[PDB]
Amino acid sequence: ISHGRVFRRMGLGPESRIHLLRNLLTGLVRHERIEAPWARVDEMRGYAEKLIDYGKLGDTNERAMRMADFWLTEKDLIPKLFQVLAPRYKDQTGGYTRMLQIPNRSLDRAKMAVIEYKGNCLPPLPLPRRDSHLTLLNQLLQGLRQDLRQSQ
Amino acid sequence: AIQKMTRVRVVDNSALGNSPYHRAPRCIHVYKKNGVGKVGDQILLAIKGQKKKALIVGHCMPGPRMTPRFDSNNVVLIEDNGNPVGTRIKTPIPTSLRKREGEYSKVLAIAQNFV
Amino acid sequence: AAPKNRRTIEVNRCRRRNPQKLIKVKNNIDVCPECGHLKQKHVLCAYCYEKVCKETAEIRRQIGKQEGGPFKAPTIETVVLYTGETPSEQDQGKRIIERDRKRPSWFT
RNA sequence: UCUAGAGUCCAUAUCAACAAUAGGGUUUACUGGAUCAGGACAUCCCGAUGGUGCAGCCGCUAUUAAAGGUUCGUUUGUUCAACGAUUAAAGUCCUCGUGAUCUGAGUUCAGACCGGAGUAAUCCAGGUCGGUUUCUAUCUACUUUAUUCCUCCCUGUACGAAAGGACAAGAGAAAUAAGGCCUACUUCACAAAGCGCCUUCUAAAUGAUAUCAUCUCAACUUAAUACCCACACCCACCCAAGAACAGGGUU
RNA sequence: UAAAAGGAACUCGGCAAAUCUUACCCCGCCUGUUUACCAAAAACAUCACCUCUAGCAUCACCAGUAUUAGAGGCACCGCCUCCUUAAAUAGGCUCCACGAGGGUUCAGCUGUCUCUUACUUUUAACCAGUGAAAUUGACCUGCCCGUGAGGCGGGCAUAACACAGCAA
RNA sequence: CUAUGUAGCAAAAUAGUGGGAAGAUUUAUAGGUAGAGGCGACAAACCUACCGAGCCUGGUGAUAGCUGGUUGUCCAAGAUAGA
RNA sequence: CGCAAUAGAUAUAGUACCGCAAGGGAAAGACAAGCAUAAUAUAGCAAGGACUAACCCCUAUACCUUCUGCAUAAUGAAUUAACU
Ligand SMILES: [Mg+2]
Ligand SMILES: [Mg+2]
Ligand SMILES: [Mg+2]
Ligand SMILES: [Mg+2]
Ligand SMILES: [Mg+2]
Ligand SMILES: [Mg+2]
Ligand SMILES: [Mg+2]
Ligand SMILES: [Mg+2]
Ligand SMILES: [Mg+2]
Ligand SMILES: [Mg+2]
Ligand SMILES: [Mg+2]
Ligand SMILES: [Mg+2]
Ligand SMILES: [Mg+2]
Ligand SMILES: [Mg+2]
Ligand SMILES: [Mg+2]
Ligand SMILES: [Mg+2]
Ligand SMILES: [Zn+2]
């Protein structure tokens, strides 16, 4: 039975789980885009979001500083968190990271995933667009837009 | 949960009990179909190498909400025909003995304090 | 325990070729409508993703060559500029990572 | 089965001696326990009925009844027996029932000691201490078919020779079993659980063979619903659904 | 790893675990040695004591000589040649010290148990790679009753097929 | 002593709990004792994984009143006193 | 009226490899079974009588060896090829 347990089980125990997610999160803050196994990235996305939330409070706060000290291992990144990432998202109140699935890994055929922090300098991921607005179904729906707007 | 093989401290001034003895009183039987005994369930005790009927008047096991949860498994010695052997009780006894039927009227006429 | 009798080729064929053990035909493949390569719906075009990772790696090699050694995460944003692209009016005060090939058409 | 002998009178209220008719074994001298239990009734309890010498609950025997239940411990292990406390009860047997589910004692493994027999080696259907049986499931089969007790009214009527003391009908309280839940307590903490909570449905009347009579292997007349239930999808994500597959949701 | 109340009611036995105390009894004096791979012991050895044999050269005893050497028995030393439990088939020549020896008891402790529960790790189930072995007459491999049992007889049942369990 | 493991990591291990740990201790190195023999704080203990008597070659194709086997077609006669 | 690559020497070799050692001691070179093409459909020693028809109907207690006969009471055999 596992009803209502939101935390995956990975590594050699709870502690190794936190440490694995910590290394993933450090790599993400250092490079702003990493390809990792899908389940691990899905577990780490929440932590990266809340890390940006803690980083918005700013250097002066001590709780946020302790948290970013634990969750960043090469400390050169703590400046970045408080001076490049958190400032970058002064407008967005949520959803700072985008997560996609990518071709499975060559060796062990695992389910992969690229995760990145929105707005970085890197070449943009090939996001999937929706169908062009000029397609047949969209045109008929646009006609319905007009005809319903005039009636109402 | 006053079941078989549990130590209970007699609190009734115990004309019989309360005297030194290397053993301590133990419950050897509970007069309920199942073993567990709750308040008012009269049990049997091996005290001073003798067998004597008892009556539970408090236990460390949490009960319902509005009834007391003592910290010692308290018992009153009662004679076979229901008469309490002692003549006094000092430790508080719960007011949850005026409830569900049993030989409890005498045991309240002999105590002095409630909770 | 151990088997009491060999199992015949007939029983083994009714097990091995049962549908539950067959490989299912995938109903979710298609063609990248613009790029024109195969892809699953919920996954990135493999060829496009590879051509993106190549450029990301080249950019990162330049970044490493400029930062010198480890422990040098800058405290400012970064912008990457290809040949014949002066730093725009918005990118002053941001580190520049020069590259020596024409900007890819897919890089916006 | 004959009652024949008894029983303060009297075989039938009880033993019922011999025998007869029935079902069943007797091998030594000249295999338990845990786990799960399937089944019979020759019934321990609960249920229904007859007689009683029970004038009455209970007792006694007799018929019927196998849906349900049939406790925990001290000493010990040819497996029983004794003893304490209870209980409505602690039933008699078949399938050690069950060791590719687990354990112990043994009886028969090498070590050693004590007692008996022997010149000795050694024996002993003796007593002690110690002591290793491994298994990845191929096939079959299978994996979602409410009782009891106590208390109280009804009261101490009938029954009853005094004395004691009923049914039918209800109302509370507890446990157990099945099924389910997490508001509180408890172990814990997006949840799973119990020590907690909730629900459980053979005596008569008429009457012939035999005109009275006679309960009739005479005719003839009387003493479970509930639950499930939408033909045609399945890429992706989530899930109180889940081993995979399935199932619920994506407004 | 954690655990409500109870704390040995488990069990052959407090084995395991948690906690740290006490008292006695049997055997053996003690440290030691032993059945490499089921027995570590109450067996062997052991100081102490006793008995038997032996008057002596250059390869052991021994470059030794009766207070010596070899072979045996025994095992220092001193002393002689009714209670327990509620209940009980269990426990209760002197002789300190010691024992992973055997039996019993007090107190504590605890998931041993009343009565199980949660979480973690490995295993596990699925995807991908590599890939055994015992076993195997053939099998198109059902149930009940009888005979003497998947296969015979008489009844019953019965569309095919994976996957995970269980152990009649 | 318990649990895991039982084609196992291992033809006797692993984890914990344990006995000894200045001695009759433990141990590296070369030599010696050789099979009815050696050695043995006797357990029939050990002498290269299997010792109430090593291992290899030879006599040896040991012997076996015991077990197991014994190969084309077709026909015909064919069975239970006893010493 | 000797063998022709499981024979003939053990031999391509006393090599490889096993053993501390004595010692042991190989293999080989020039459309059989198993599968795929093509999974299965009530029922049962898997066949026979048949039938228009594959199944359906009726009949039908595997083989060797050992015990007086053995329902498989027990022993032996996964199966092909070569040698026996
Ligand atoms: Mg893992
Ligand atoms: Mg719990
Ligand atoms: Mg506890
Ligand atoms: Mg010792
Ligand atoms: Mg010892
Ligand atoms: Mg696989
Ligand atoms: Mg049968
Ligand atoms: Mg299966
Ligand atoms: Mg011969
Ligand atoms: Mg003979
Ligand atoms: Mg003939
Ligand atoms: Mg040859
Ligand atoms: Mg040859
Ligand atoms: Mg072929
Ligand atoms: Mg058979
Ligand atoms: Mg065989
Ligand atoms: Zn594309």
Side-chain angles (χ1 to χ4, degrees):
Chain A
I1 320 184
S2 112
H3 295 159
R5 308 232 175 282
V6 294
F7 299 122
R8 290 177 167 69
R9 284 157 56 176
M10 57 181 69
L12 322 169
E15 188 178 335
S16 184
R17 154 167 180 275
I18 287 295
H19 290 204
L20 282 173
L21 301 175
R22 168 165 84 196
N23 291 267
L24 292 190
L25 176 46
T26 289
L28 184 49
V29 172
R30 172 172 274 279
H31 303 284
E32 306 173 86
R33 178 195 285 166
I34 55 125
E35 320 175 346
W38 184 95
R40 293 169 175 178
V41 159
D42 183 287
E43 199 65 12
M44 170 264 262
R45 200 186 197 179
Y47 289 100
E49 301 271 339
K50 287 208 176 191
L51 178 67
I52 283 288
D53 248 12
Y54 269 89
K56 275 188 188 195
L57 305 205
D59 297 319
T60 59
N61 194 329
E62 173 60 13
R63 200 174 63 93
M65 198 67 202
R66 206 158 76 248
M67 195 68 63
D69 186 4
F70 182 80
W71 280 98
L72 270 60
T73 55
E74 39 273 38
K75 314 302 191 175
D76 306 83
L77 304 178
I78 294 181
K80 195 167 186 174
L81 170 57
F82 282 108
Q83 299 188 41
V84 173
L85 298 179
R88 179 192 295 166
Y89 307 96
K90 63 177 89 73
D91 310 326
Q92 292 78 353
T93 186
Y96 320 93
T97 47
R98 65 163 60 105
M99 166 188 180
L100 310 175
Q101 176 173 0
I102 53 167
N104 304 23
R105 204 194 265 148
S106 66
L107 284 178
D108 59 13
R109 296 285 145 171
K111 208 190 185 179
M112 276 292 119
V114 70
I115 178 163
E116 75 177 10
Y117 262 133
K118 283 179 165 292
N120 58 82
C121 57
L122 305 173
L125 292 176
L127 276 294
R129 294 189 69 258
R130 286 196 180 272
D131 269 322
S132 170
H133 187 41
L134 295 174
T135 61
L136 183 61
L137 174 60
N138 302 118
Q139 289 292 271
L140 303 189
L141 287 168
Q142 186 74 35
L144 200 143
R145 299 301 114 85
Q146 266 67 105
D147 207 332
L148 191 68
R149 274 192 195 173
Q150 67 180 14
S151 54
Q152 306 306 137
Chain B
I2 311 311
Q3 53 178 79
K4 300 173 84 95
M5 308 297 288
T6 186
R7 275 82 67 84
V8 305
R9 58 181 281 183
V10 177
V11 286
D12 62 335
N13 113 105
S14 217
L16 180 84
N18 277 126
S19 59
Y21 191 93
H22 49 289
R23 295 307 84 172
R26 281 180 178 275
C27 169
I28 53 167
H29 183 254
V30 185
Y31 287 51
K32 271 175 57 172
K33 304 279 181 178
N34 55 342
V36 174
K38 310 290 188 183
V39 174
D41 299 326
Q42 61 120 310
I43 70 191
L44 191 68
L45 286 188
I47 179 51
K48 284 183 70 172
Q50 188 166 332
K51 287 184 276 285
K52 202 71 153 182
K53 298 271 276 288
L55 178 56
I56 292 159
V57 299
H59 52 70
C60 211
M61 184 171 208
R65 295 302 94 71
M66 296 273 148
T67 59
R69 183 266 193 194
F70 290 63
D71 64 356
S72 69
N73 313 315
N74 298 334
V75 164
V76 181
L77 288 172
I78 52 168
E79 182 54 24
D80 278 315
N81 73 76
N83 276 10
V85 65
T87 52
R88 291 289 104 86
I89 313 183
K90 195 183 290 183
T91 301
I93 73 185
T95 60
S96 307
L97 275 71
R98 190 164 164 80
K99 67 191 305 302
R100 298 158 301 176
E101 75 306 350
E103 289 286 322
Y104 305 143
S105 291
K106 298 168 175 177
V107 179
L108 295 180
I110 196 172
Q112 61 86 6
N113 189 356
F114 301 78
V115 313
Chain C
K4 272 290 289 294
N5 300 98
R6 184 174 181 274
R7 278 203 296 198
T8 16
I9 194 63
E10 292 97 47
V11 179
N12 288 3
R13 274 200 207 101
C14 285
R15 189 186 63 243
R16 295 174 203 181
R17 313 190 196 202
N18 169 278
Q20 180 272 12
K21 284 191 165 66
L22 291 167
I23 288 170
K24 292 179 184 301
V25 179
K26 285 178 174 63
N27 293 308
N28 64 11
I29 289 175
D30 63 350
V31 173
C32 208
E34 181 169 338
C35 307
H37 321 119
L38 291 151
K39 86 187 279 287
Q40 318 199 57
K41 300 180 178 302
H42 59 284
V43 172
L44 276 60
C45 182
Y47 190 73
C48 313
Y49 187 27
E50 280 284 52
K51 90 200 172 185
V52 168
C53 257
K54 291 282 162 288
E55 271 296 293
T56 298
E58 229 58 25
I59 281 172
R60 282 170 181 171
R61 266 192 278 287
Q62 295 297 123
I63 278 178
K65 193 173 70 171
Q66 295 304 332
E67 280 181 14
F71 307 117
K72 299 294 179 62
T75 331
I76 50 170
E77 295 282 19
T78 311
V79 316
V80 43
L81 308 175
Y82 297 80
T83 64
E85 311 303 343
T86 309
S88 78
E89 181 59 19
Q90 179 50 44
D91 55 53
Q92 284 73 27
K94 312 172 89 178
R95 182 182 57 178
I96 62 183
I97 310 300
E98 186 210 348
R99 282 229 60 201
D100 64 341
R101 50 158 294 191
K102 285 167 173 296
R103 158 163 287 197
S105 308
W106 46 274
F107 203 149
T108 171

